[PDB]
Design a binder for this molecule. Structure first.
Ligand SMILES: Nc1nc2c(ncn2[C@@H]2O[C@H](COP(=O)(O)OP(=O)(O)O)[C@@H](O)[C@H]2O)c(=O)[nH]1
Ligand SMILES: [Mg+2]
Length: 561
């Protein structure tokens, strides 16, 4: 009784048809997407909660997973599952959800249902439980036709098989209807007429308008309020309801400025629901002021405790990152998920008009049970077979453990590896030019395990360091090619300590370029950032980043050796 409820989330890569699919389920029932679509189908109430784009480090995904009891993975019948929906799927498994895989667009010519089944199944290499991987039902669809079926040759005349699968395989909400009222805010919304809107799935009890209630946050603070309106979902809309009970995904009004993870409880029996997720950062990196003599050249405006507050602004757009204070009052220890995470932060921190010095990314070590541990992660690589012998030995040098390989049959091959983040850092740069830029690479954090004894091979080559400040002349640069490749041509402005090229030998060579050329080496942010040794820093400015030593003079460098 009152358990005909099906709270399910939906995951789909762009243009894989999740808007069309949900739309068909709506029009064929008794009732861009909406955040939640309520569907009445034969006295069943199915809530389809939407998942955000592949780039949402705010932590909305895990909030969504906290409201649903299953997830709906929509996959193109030809393209198969995309690595963009990787993490959203990962978090679904992390919340112990058993997925329902919908392979739609089955009507397109060359659709390979059998193949995309394997791909999805293999994609569940997300340390996914047997329970999750075994018996995930496969509903084939053609959303643009409104047709579904358990087989793709044998298809129903409507979306009935999909409805049935949802009813059959999605568990009812694990809630008690008779307990005292309890509801955690999962998402927020606003209406200039209604005010702040709190959205979530009622964990316990019931709620009516004008009900007296107590709000308790994650730390333990409490405040009393009276709910104004209880908005239930019906279609793509929200209507005022006189009663909402456990299991219902509803919207509440007039509780003031609700914060996410606040728990709305009956005035007595105030019980805060546990704060849910946190993506522990695995890669640390230093953000420093531009100590360089080019302090305010192109960099619009930055002092010490200026960009610091910007490192207190990105702190809620993402909780996978941390920001700590270093002894150097002009440098800060900011950590994150991967290197790509901290990378793009800079990329339009640059377009934001900033200038900063940044070290090389290092993995965050953790000591557990006396044994130090480092982050390992799963890597899938898609290269041409002319590169497979090359990229294999490369990862092997980076302490990569081979787990699986699968030839394309058409000249390519997909490789799978278990590798510590330590050895994977800055490999994307080497990888691309190694595979001539046709190869592809994807990564996903797996687990912390005992550190692999040893270190990753260092840069081997030394660097050409400028001894003074001035304009680089063609007469000197031509003589420098006798000892390696350089980073600029005639006319470029350089200072002392700045690295201008790559030494042919292993040692650092202090050279002057002040007293026609071969094409200079231009490095992108990530390409350069993978070139950096522990005694160096990248200097980033809104038009182009440059490279330098930590200690600018040759006198200071000798002391630190
Ligand atoms: N041929 C074909 N096209 C489809 C099917 N389902 C959806 N589409 C098309 O895919 C395009 C984008 O799908 P959409 O619903 O927006 O998916 P979303 O972008 O992930 O929300 C639309 O133009 C649809 O016409 C299908 O079963 N067959
Ligand atoms: Mg669209």
């Amino acid at each position: 009784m009152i358990e005909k409820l099906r709270n399910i989330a939906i995951i789909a890569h762009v243009d894989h048809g999740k808007t069309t699919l949900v739309d068909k389920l709506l029009q064929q029932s008794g009732t861009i997407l909406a955040k939640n679509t309520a569907i009445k189908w034969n006295d069943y109430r199915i809530n389809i909660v939407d998942t955000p784009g592949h780039a949402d480090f705010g932590g909305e995904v895990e909030r969504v997973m906290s409201m649903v009891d299953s997830v709906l993975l929509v996959v193109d019948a030809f393209d198969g599952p995309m690595p963009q929906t990787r993490f959203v799927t990962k978090k679904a498994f992390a919340y112990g959800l058993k997925p329902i895989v919908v392979i739609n667009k089955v009507d397109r010519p060359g659709a390979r249902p059998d193949w995309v089944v394997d791909q999805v199944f293999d994609l569940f290499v997300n340390l996914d439980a047997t329970d999750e991987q075994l018996d995930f039902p496969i509903v084939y669809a053609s959303a643009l036709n409104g047709i579904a079926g358990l087989d793709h040759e044998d298809m129903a005349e409507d979306m009935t098989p999909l409805y049935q699968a949802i009813v059959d395989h999605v568990p009812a909400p694990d809630v008690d209807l008779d307990g005292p009222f309890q509801m955690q805010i999962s998402q927020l919304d606003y209406n200039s007429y209604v005010g702040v809107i709190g959205i979530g799935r009622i964990k316990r009890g019931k709620v009516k308008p004008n009900q007296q209630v107590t709000i308790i946050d994650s730390e333990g603070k409490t405040r009393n309020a009276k709910v104004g309106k209880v908005l239930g979902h019906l279609g793509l809309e929200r209507i005022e309801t006189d009663l909402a009970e456990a299991g219902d995904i509803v919207a509440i009004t007039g509780l003031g400025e609700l914060n996410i993870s606040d728990t709305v409880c009956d005035t007595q029996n105030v019980e805060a629901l546990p704060a849910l997720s946190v993506d522990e950062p695995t890669v640390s990196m230093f953000f420093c002021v531009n100590t360089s003599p080019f302090c305010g050249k192109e960099g619009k405006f930055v002092t010490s405790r200026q960009i610091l507050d910007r490192l207190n602004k990105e702190l809620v757009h993402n909780v996978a990152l941390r920001v700590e204070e270093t002894e150097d009052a002009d440098a800060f220890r900011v950590s994150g998920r991967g290197e790509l995470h901290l990378s793009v932060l800079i990329e339009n921190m640059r377009r934001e008009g900033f200038e900063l010095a940044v070290s090389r990314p290092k993995v965050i070590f953790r000591e557990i049970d006396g044994r130090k541990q480092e982050p390992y992660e799963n890597v899938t690589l898609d290269v041409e077979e002319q590169h497979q012998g090359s990229v294999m030995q490369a990862l092997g040098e980076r302490k990569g453990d081979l787990k699986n390989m699968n030839p394309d049959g058409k000249g390519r091959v997909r490789l799978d590896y278990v590798i510590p983040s330590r050895g994977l850092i800055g490999f994307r740069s080497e990888f691309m030019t190694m595979t001539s830029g046709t190869g592809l690479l994807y990564s996903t954090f797996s687990h912390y395990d005992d550190v692999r004894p040893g270190e990753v091979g260092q840069r081997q080559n030394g660097v050409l360091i400028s001894n003074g400040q001035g304009k680089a002349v063609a007469f000197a640069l031509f003589g420098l090619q006798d000892r390696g490749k350089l980073f600029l041509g005639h006319g470029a402005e350089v200072y002392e300590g700045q690295i201008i090229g790559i030494h042919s030998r292993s040692n650092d060579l202090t050279v002057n370029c002040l007293t026609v050329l071969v094409p200079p080496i231009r490095m992108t942010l990530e390409q350069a950032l993978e070139f950096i040794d522990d005694d160096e820093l990248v200097e980033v400015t809104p038009t182009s980043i440059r490279i330098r030593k930590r200690h600018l003079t040759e006198n200071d460098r000798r002391r630190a050796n």
